[PDB]
Amino acid sequence: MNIKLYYVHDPMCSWCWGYKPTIEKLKQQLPGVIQFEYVVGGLAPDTNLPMPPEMQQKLEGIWKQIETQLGTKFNYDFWKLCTPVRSTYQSCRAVIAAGFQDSYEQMLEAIQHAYYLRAMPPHEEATHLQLAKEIGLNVQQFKNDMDGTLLEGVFQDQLSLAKSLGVNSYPSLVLQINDAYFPIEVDYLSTEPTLKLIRERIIENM
Amino acid sequence: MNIKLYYVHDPMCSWCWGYKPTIEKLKQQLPGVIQFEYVVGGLAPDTNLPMPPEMQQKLEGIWKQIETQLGTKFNYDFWKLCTPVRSTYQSCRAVIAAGFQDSYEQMLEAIQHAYYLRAMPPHEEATHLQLAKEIGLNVQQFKNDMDGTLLEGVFQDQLSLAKSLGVNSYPSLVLQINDAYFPIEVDYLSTEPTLKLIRERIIENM
Ligand SMILES: [Mg+2]
């Protein structure tokens, strides 16, 4: 029997940044027989149009919700210092490209820190290349990888997979057992109920 | 995947009687893939040696501990009304003979109630016959099965199975997953920690 937990996220998703300490603990605690697979869900298509000011006020107020409920840190200067753009695809391509040099998780964290703490635009090339350097990547290979057809192939496969798993919001977990798929509820604060749900599913399917 | 939970017990073990409501709940709650198997371990070989006063007092003090810790019921008149004998192989034969007529659990409970509640001597043949009659067994067949070499064989095989499973004392639980065996700690007051131990072990071996 073949068992996999998909974690469907976006580097620019606020709740996923709120979820970070728990999903990392979850992945560490998961039994070794379960593969863990990240899937970018692709929160917003490529675009250069600046975010209209109502959408900016909304997203800012969501950061404050997450801070209140989860204790998550945000540098609110992002809304003052940057021109926010509703576009997340480049940041998904950056994490996948970093994954080619075995640094998927290091780049994911670096983009979340950039966006939520460092007041840096997470959709910009300048940010991605500055992060690639900081994280120790071969910057030139990372830049060629971002622009190659191999990466658009991988990226497209993950966007289709997120829709195929039935995911329309982030973060989401889906557990696969052979040919069957089971959504798993996210618990933001604790790993214990999530592991219970996973073990229970596996055992009901034996 | 072949999964089996062995419960190793003796009808005349007083902690097994203290365990009874929890082990019965456990057996009801077990996921359907796990088979439950009773194994008699044979606390003490056949004998007529009278239990002397110091051991009668030690065993009665254990009954009090069990009552204090678990709320278990005892009729202490056993200690005034009977001549106790530490001899349990016959009582193990009796539950196996009742199992030949699909009444293993009914005879096990009738022996516990006879010993702990009815102040009846649990090692005496007259007790076994009386319980066989009270639970509605074919009494003639029960006596033939008790005296036969067939039952002696099944009984010796249980004594060897219990020792093979690593068990010297009761109650004990051992989980078999294919060819691997895992001791599972007993929790006298609830099933939830024990089910979690079982689920964790199964997922850790697949
Ligand atoms: Mg004795």
Q: Distance between CA atoms of A94 and A123, rounded to whole angstroms?
A: 10
- For chain B, how many structural domains are there in total? 1
Q: Which of A1, A200, A204 is opposite residue B206, by nearest beta carbon?
A: A1
Structure tokens at A31: 């039994």
Structure tokens at B83: 């001549």
- HSE-CB of A158 using CA atoms within 13 angstroms: 23
Could you write out the DSSP letters of every residue in B50-117?
A: BPPHHHHHHHHHHHHHHHHHH-----TTHHHHS--B---HHHHHHHHHHHTTT-HHHHHHHHHHHHHT
Token pair 């072990």 in the structure block, residue: B201
| Type of residue found at A38 | Y
Kindly give the distance from the C-alpha atom of residue B77 to the centroid of ligand 1, in angstroms, as a whole number. 18
**Contact yes or no for A203 and B1 at CB 8 A:** no
Token pair 């749900």 in the structure block, residue: A197
Which residues in chain B touch residue A4, judged by CB atoms under 8 angstroms apart?
A: none
Nearest CA to B182 out of B172, B193, B192 is that of B172
Q: Name every residue whose Cβ is closer than 8 Å to that of residue A170 and which is 6 or more positions away in sequence.
A: A8, A9, A10, A13, A15, A16, A41, A43
Buried b (16+ CB within 10 A) or exposed e, A30-56: bbeebeeebbbbbbbeeeeeebeeeeb
Which residues in chain A touch residue B33, judged by CB atoms under 8 angstroms apart?
A: 203, 206
Structure tokens at B69: 């810790």
Q: Name every residue whose Cβ is closer than 8 Å to that of residue B76 and which is 6 or more positions away in sequence.
A: B60, B63
Structure tokens at A130: 């500055």
Could you write out the DSSP letters of every residue in A160-180?
A: HHHHHTT--SSSEEEEEETTE
Q: Distance between CA atoms of A56 and A117, rounded to whole angstroms?
A: 17
> What one-character DSSP code corresponds to residue B169?
S
**Contact yes or no for B199 and A199 at CB 8 A:** yes
Parent domain of A98 = 1-206
Could you write out the DSSP letters of every residue in A97-134?
A: HHHHTT-HHHHHHHHHHHHHTS---TT-HHHHHHHHHH
Distance from CA of A127 to the nearest CA of B (A): 42
* Helix H or strand E encompassing B20: helix B14-29
Helices and strands, counts by H and E, chain B = 9, 4
* Helix H or strand E encompassing B9: strand B3-9
Nearest CA to B42 out of B146, B149, B162 is that of B162
**Contact yes or no for B199 and A200 at CB 8 A:** yes
**Contact yes or no for A31 and B1 at CB 8 A:** no
Kindly give the distance from the C-alpha atom of residue B83 to the centroid of ligand 1, in angstroms, as a whole number. 12
**Contact yes or no for A203 and B31 at CB 8 A:** yes
Kindly give the distance from the C-alpha atom of residue A188 to the centroid of ligand 1, in angstroms, as a whole number. 57
Nearest CA to A204 out of B203, B186, B19, B141 is that of B203
Structure tokens at A69: 């409920």
Nearest CA to B83 out of B49, B126, B131, B133 is that of B49
CATH number at residue B35: 3.40.30.10
Contact between residue B184 and residue B175 where contact means Cβ atoms under 8 Å apart: yes
* Helix H or strand E encompassing B19: helix B14-29
**Residues of chain B whose C-beta is under 8 A from some C-beta in A?**
1, 3, 31, 33, 199-200, 202-204, 206
Q: Does residue B181 have a known ligand-binding role?
A: yes
B34-40 vs B172-177, strand pairing mode: unpaired
Nearest CA to B99 out of B157, B17, B45 is that of B157
Q: Distance between CA atoms of A116 and A135, rounded to whole angstroms?
A: 17
Token pair 């006596």 in the structure block, residue: B143
Which residues share a beta bridge with B36? B5
Nearest CA to A111 out of A96, A97, A98, A128 is that of A128
Token pair 């109650």 in the structure block, residue: B171
State the resolution, in angstroms: 2.1
Question: Could you tell me the strand order of the sheet in which B3-9 lies?
Answer: B34-40, B3-9, B172-177, B180-184
B3-9 vs A35-40, strand pairing mode: unpaired
Q: Mutate which of A3, A35, A194, A199 to disrupt the B interface (most B C-beta within 10 Å)?
A: A199
| Type of residue found at B34 | I
Q: Which residue of B has its CA nearest to A206?
A: B33
| Torsion (CA) B108, B112, B113, B114 in degrees, nearest 10 | 100
Q: Distance between CA atoms of A33 and A53, rounded to whole angstroms?
A: 47
Q: Name every residue whose Cβ is closer than 8 Å to that of residue B131 and which is 6 or more positions away in sequence.
A: B94, B107, B110, B111, B114
